Design an enzyme around this catalytic site. Structure first.
Site, PDB file in Angstrom:
ATOM      1  N   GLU A 162      -4.812   8.400  11.733  1.00 14.22           N
ATOM      2  CA  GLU A 162      -3.938   7.301  11.436  1.00 14.22           C
ATOM      3  C   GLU A 162      -3.420   6.769  12.732  1.00 14.22           C
ATOM      4  O   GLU A 162      -3.411   7.459  13.750  1.00 14.22           O
ATOM      5  N   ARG A 163      -3.007   5.485  12.708  1.00 10.88           N
ATOM      6  CA  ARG A 163      -2.360   4.837  13.812  1.00 10.88           C
ATOM      7  C   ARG A 163      -0.958   5.341  13.785  1.00 10.88           C
ATOM      8  O   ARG A 163      -0.320   5.332  12.738  1.00 10.88           O
ATOM      9  N   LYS A 193       0.795  -1.199   0.000  1.00 17.04           N
ATOM     10  CA  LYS A 193       0.000   0.000   0.000  1.00 17.04           C
ATOM     11  C   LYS A 193       0.825   1.244   0.000  1.00 17.04           C
ATOM     12  O   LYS A 193       0.599   2.144  -0.802  1.00 17.04           O
TER      13      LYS A 193
END
Lengths: 50, 468, 499, 56, 85, 62
Positions: free
Chosen positions: B182-183, B156
């Site tokens: 986002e993490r 990705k």
């Protein structure tokens, strides 16, 4: 033709900021005073027409 | 000059009372000085009595009722333009890259109207990614939203980085990566990888501006962070006149944040807990992403579907604006394709002949069948061979392997990594290249000659070098 | 130039108001200004803020009047003057909206200059009564063979175009609009359906494509596109089909015919949900407003085939409903299915499997159906319905040891299925629908191989045109297949099959 | 026109059946068909060279 | 559960039926994912366990087919035998 | 009133705006003439090809 169209919009935005410049001048002027009288008498005419 | 006092803090809702009698407008940003902090509150409602209800962006820890609140006088304004390139910026438009002040010129208010109907370009156009499988079988929309389906591990990030490279080459653009919710682990990894790939070059231009919103930030900040990103991309379109990439990882967090914000604002919960405002929230996001006379913002939008349930209102609302899907796939990566774009599961609503031309559409349709026949036939081949299959069927089967091989394009970003020279086969060249293979004019040189090469010329050159 | 037009606009600012009803916002939150003032206010009256925002006053509460903003909250601020326009929602109606893409207010968003407004008529108008209706019998073709034969479409009657999310539903609808060009071009005004496409919640990029497609097929002269795009405010989205309906009424009232395609009512629903929930009105099933049934029914009942005493006119409608992944039991789908009479149910599996149009014949029904249908087309298509029914049942039996009977069904059925494929954005005439179906019914196509069905189709049409465009013209004008025509047609088909 | 040429061409193909040695004779005929079809789409592609300086 | 799943970087699903089946840990191998993945396990252990995941996944697929009955080809029954072990 | 004031002020005080044709040129495509009016190439001159062809294919009829 495309750039010509671009010029029509660009001109409109140029004259728009030029209009803002006219606004700043107007709100300074003692037209600010003189037009209060104009509004006053105009409202007199309106409210008398009631 | 216009000041108020905190009068309630209950969760992330802060009620500020203005005694001024000239209250801030809706969506204006108020700011509070805090000891280690500035706290931006966005005015969400006027409750009347000169009390305004505001949603906190940053934390609400240790606030003292009666704290003086300063009206910043407009919405949150974020620095915009080239000076933002290669900076990590939090939602409140302050550099969190710790590379010192951004030193930007203009800052623009984050809420900005989407272009008017007339303003929109009336013609659909194809953005040339260069990437062979992408341009042939799932052609990107120019200034549309391309859905990226797939998690991590399917390459990705490498896909994203190759898109960043290729647009920077082919359209000379800049990109904004917006990490919506986002993490933080993935954020660190991404930042690192982008410096490694050198899309972000610390010295010299960075092809991408990073706006990152960790999940750690309170609900208000994770909602609004998407709009901060959007505003930078708008500047690059309108002012810089570019075709811009706007990576939005990931749309589910946009919805999810909006749900939480709505709940906090005390709107009666909508179905399966979503916001009542769900449609207009999405509307404000997606309608700002568009092609205009100025340029385009093409948004590549990663979608992580909650619980693999893609019929929940958040997916359903998301899919309403996606114009293409790129399905990066484990299985395709098993075959060893770069990228790993599944040719038969990547769909584009701009696939049609009316957009790509009849020639391209015919070619793509023929390819779709050439591939697809092999994917079904491969079950028959595995039991009884392709010799059981008709000689002409066998030709299609052989050609399918050549096509599949030819769909792998070595990536420019992967020059840094693997060391295979990047190929950015132009759209016209791509169509022609596959057309020649369909016409069987290169169904005579090794399957392996098509593996990891560029144009049809590079198939030939590779074939010669294989023989040698 | 640019200066002169601007100078004209400023010169076109004149006069002074005689205001007499004003309000001051008490609180504005969540698009629900609650205004102190507006003592006399009509229900859903338009009120104009000092910012210039327009609103409706859906709630007239006992102490305050709860305006719903048609603008953004951004420009409305507390204490703001709220002038009372004094007119309940109305939109321009007239022939002036022909070739005009207008927003809900009526402002041309295609900027083709101010609408030639022949009236402004209210957006809420009660549906024609029992006795004003008169039975449907006038066909409306679709140029899609499957639609015209399997589920024939009349006038003033509503049937769904219900199917799974973005399976190019909009394309199926758009095709109908294109086919109306053939009759529309025709001067007889009993052959002129002036279509209205109501783009609800559709992104501006999508509507740009629509506008472009319509311009390309030069259909912008019987088209009006009422547009409430995704960005456009939830009140505008709420009133958008209602506004559209009023536009339809003018055509209907004029005794003309027209087809209004509400696409998609699913987005109308979401907007009403947003309004009701935001106005704190009691929520209901699936968090959709309690009176959502009532809303949908009001819209869908305005479609009407008028009586000759009230001047025979019509307002055919075809709402397009988006199924939320196939849930036809879902509250908004179930309600709509009940309200309308007929459904055409496109099926996702078929779409993916390349059968476009992706109509699932089984789940398509018309409750008016063959009552309006060209007599010729009816004659040669009773068989077609039955054959397809058999083909479906014997479809799964493909899974080996196959009876001769099953094999006959399979061959005829597979060819028929292939025949009803049609390339989107290409309409067909009835005079060319009737021949193609004739071949299939008579099993001529059975001989033709599947790959050659496509070639056969176009060739058969050209062959028919060359050999006997007399036959075609007879079909077109007579509208009823005579035994002599069926005889001659069979001969022509035999001859074509031979070549 | 092409149609005189093509009736004679395809008739000759069905005559070429009745001999063998039409190995690349038919391929020459196919080429003649190709370029003939090319001029027909060429003639359909054309716009008058000059701008419509009436409107534009 | 929905909220947490999104937040966390892996899921280590256990399954009650498999507990009863006597697999302890009852880790439901198919539902268990590690989105941080292999680059955290011992290099040796990575090498040996390379196709272990593939085999188990194949075992799961084969097992489903196996319960719909009918004689299975020997290659499939190699999978079945390996899978059981 | 105010209408007149603005009208007057704007109209009078601005009635020229920038407009350089040269700047326009940068933003538009340049006209340049066609290339290669090349006359077709002549090939397969003489009965040299034909005599060769009659001989070359052994199967002249079978």
């Amino acid at each position: 033709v495309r750039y010509e169209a671009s010029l029509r919009q660009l001109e409109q935005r140029q004259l728009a900021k030029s209009v803002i410049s006219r606004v700043q001048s107007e709100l300074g002027n003692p037209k600010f005073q003189e037009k209060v009288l104009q509004q006053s008498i105009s409202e007199i005419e309106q409210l008398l027409s009631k | 000059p216009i000041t108020g006092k905190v009068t309630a803090v209950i969760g992330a809702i802060v009620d500020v009372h203005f005694e001024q009698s000239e209250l801030p407008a809706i969506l204006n940003a108020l700011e509070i000085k805090t000891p280690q902090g500035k706290l931006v509150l966005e005015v969400a409602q006027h409750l009347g009595e000169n009390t305004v209800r505001t949603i906190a962006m940053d934390g609400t820890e240790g606030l003292v009722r009666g704290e003086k609140v300063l009206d910043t006088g407009g919405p949150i304004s974020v620095p915009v333009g080239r000076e933002t390139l290669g900076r990590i910026i939090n939602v409140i438009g302050e550099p969190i890259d710790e590379r010192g002040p951004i030193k930007s010129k203009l800052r623009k208010p984050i809420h900005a109207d989407p272009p008017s109907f007339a303003e929109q370009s009336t013609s659909a156009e194809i953005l040339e990614t260069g990437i062979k499988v992408v341009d042939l079988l799932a052609p990107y929309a120019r200034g549309g939203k391309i859905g990226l389906f797939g998690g991590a591990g399917v390459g990705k990030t490498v896909f994203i980085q190759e898109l960043i490279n290729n647009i920077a080459k082919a359209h000379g653009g800049f990109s904004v990566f917006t990490g919506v919710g986002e993490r933080t682990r993935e954020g660190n990894d991404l930042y690192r990888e982008m410096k490694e790939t050198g899309v972000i070059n610390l010295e010299g231009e960075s092809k991408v501006a990073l706006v990152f919103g960790q999940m750690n930030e309170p609900p208000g900040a994770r909602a609004r962070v998407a709009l901060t990103g959007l505003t930078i991309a708008e500047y690059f379109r309108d002012e810089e006149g570019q075709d811009v990439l706007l990576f939005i990882d990931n749309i589910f967090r946009f919805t999810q944040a909006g749900s939480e914000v709505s709940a906090l604002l005390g709107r009666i919960p909508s179905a399966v807990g979503y916001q009542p405002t769900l449609a207009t929230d999405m509307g404000l996001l997606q309608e700002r992403i568009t092609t205009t006379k100025k340029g385009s913002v093409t948004s590549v939008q990663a979608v992580y579907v909650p619980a693999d349930d893609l019929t929940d209102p958040a997916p359903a609302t998301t899919f309403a604006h996606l114009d293409a899907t790129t399905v990066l796939s484990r299985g395709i990566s098993e075959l060893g394709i770069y990228p790993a774009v599944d040719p038969l599961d990547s769909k584009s609503r701009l696939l049609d002949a009316a957009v790509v031309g009849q020639e391209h559409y015919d070619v793509a349709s023929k390819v779709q069948e050439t591939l697809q026949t092999y994917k079904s036939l491969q079950d028959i081949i595995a039991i009884l061979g392709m010799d059981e299959l008709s000689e002409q069927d066998k030709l299609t089967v052989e050609r399918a392997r050549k096509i599949q091989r030819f769909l792998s394009q070595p990536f420019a970003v992967a020059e840094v990594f693997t060391g295979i020279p990047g190929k950015l086969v132009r759209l016209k060249d791509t169509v022609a290249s596959f057309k020649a293979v369909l016409e069987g004019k290169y169904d005579n040189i090794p399957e392996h000659a098509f593996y990891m090469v560029g144009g049809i010329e590079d198939v030939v050159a590779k074939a010669e070098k294989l023989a040698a | 130039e640019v200066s002169s037009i601007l100078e004209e606009r400023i010169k076109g600012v004149s006069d002074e108001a005689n205001l007499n009803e004003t309000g001051r916002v008490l609180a504005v939150g969540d698009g629900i200004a609650r205004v102190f003032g507006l003592n006399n206010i009509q229900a859903e009256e338009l009120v104009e803020f000092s910012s210039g925002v327009k609103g409706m006053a859906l709630n007239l509460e006992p102490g305050q009047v709860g305006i719903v903003l048609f603008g953004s909250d951004r420009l409305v601020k507390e204490g703001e003057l709220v002038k009372r326009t004094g007119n309940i929602v109305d939109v321009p109606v007239g022939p002036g909206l022909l070739g005009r893409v207008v927003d809900a207010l009526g402002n041309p968003i295609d900027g083709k200059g101010p609408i030639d407004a022949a009236g402004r008529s209210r957006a809420q108008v009660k549906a024609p009564g029992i006795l004003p209706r008169r039975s449907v019998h006038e066909p409306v073709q679709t140029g899609l063979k499957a639609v015209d034969a399997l589920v024939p479409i009349g006038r003033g009657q509503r049937e769904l175009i219900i199917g799974d999310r973005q399976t190019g539903k909009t394309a199926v609808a758009l095709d109908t609009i294109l086919n109306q060009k053939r009759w529309n071009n025709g001067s007889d005004e009993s052959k002129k359906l002036y279509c209205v496409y109501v783009a609800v919640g559709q992104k501006r990029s999508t509507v740009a494509q629509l506008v472009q497609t319509l311009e390309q097929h030069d259909a912008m002269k019987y088209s009006i596109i009422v547009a409430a795009t995704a960005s456009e405010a939830a009140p505008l989205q709420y009133l958008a089909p209602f506004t559209a309906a009023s536009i339809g009424e003018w055509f209907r009232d004029n005794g003309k015919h027209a087809l209004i395609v509400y696409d998609d009512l699913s987005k109308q629903a979401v907007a009403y949900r947003q309004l009701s929930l935001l106005l704190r009105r009691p929520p209901g099933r699936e968090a959709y407003p309690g009176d959502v049934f009532y809303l949908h029914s009001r819209l869908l009942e305005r479609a009407a085939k008028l009586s000759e005493k009230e001047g025979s006119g019509s307002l055919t409608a075809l709402p397009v409903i988006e199924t939320q992944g196939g849930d036809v039991s879902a509250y908004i789908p179930t309600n709509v299915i009940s309200i309308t009479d007929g459904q055409i149910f496109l099926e996702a599996e078929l779409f993916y499997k390349g059968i476009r149009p992706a109509i699932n014949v089984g789940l398509s029904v018309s409750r008016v159906g063959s009552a309006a249908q060209v007599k010729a087309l009816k004659q040669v298509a009773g068989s077609l319905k039955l054959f397809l029914a058999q083909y479906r049942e014997v479809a799964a039996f493909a899974q080996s040891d196959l009876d001769a009977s099953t094999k006959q069904t399979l061959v005829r059925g597979e060819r028929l299925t292939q025949l009803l494929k049609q390339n989107q954005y290409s309409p067909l005439a009835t005079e060319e629908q009737v021949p193609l179906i004739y071949a299939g019914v008579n099993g001529h196509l059975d001989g033709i191989e599947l790959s050659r069905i496509g070639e056969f189709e176009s060739s058969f049409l050209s062959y028919l045109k060359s050999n006997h465009n007399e036959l075609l013209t007879e079909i077109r004008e007579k509208g009823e297949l005579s035994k002599e025509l069926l005889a001659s047609l069979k001969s022509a088909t035999e001859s074509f099959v031979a070549t | 026109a092409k149609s005189a040429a093509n009736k004679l061409d395809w008739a000759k193909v069905i005559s070429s059946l009745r001999i063998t040695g039409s190995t690349a004779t038919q391929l020459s005929s196919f080429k003649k068909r190709n370029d003939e079809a090319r001029r027909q789409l060429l003639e359909l592609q054309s716009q008058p060279t000059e701008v419509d300086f009436s409107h534009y | 559960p929905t909220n947490v799943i999104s937040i966390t970087d892996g899921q280590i699903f256990l399954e009650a039926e498999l507990f009863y089946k006597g697999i302890r840990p009852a880790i439901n191998v198919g539902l268990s994912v590690s989105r941080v993945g292999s680059a955290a396990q011992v290099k040796a252990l990575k090498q040996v366990a390379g196709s272990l995941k593939l085999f188990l996944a194949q075992y799961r697929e084969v097992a489903a087919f196996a319960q719909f009955g009918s004689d299975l080809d020997a290659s499939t029954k190699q999978t079945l035998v390996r899978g059981e072990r | 009133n105010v209408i007149q004031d603005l009208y007057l002020r704007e109209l009078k005080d601005t009635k020229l705006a920038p407009s350089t044709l040269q700047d326009a040129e940068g933003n538009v495509k340049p006209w340049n003439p066609p290339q290669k009016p090349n006359l077709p190439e002549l090939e397969l001159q003489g009965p040299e090809a034909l005599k060769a062809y009659t001989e070359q294919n052994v199967e002249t009829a079978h």
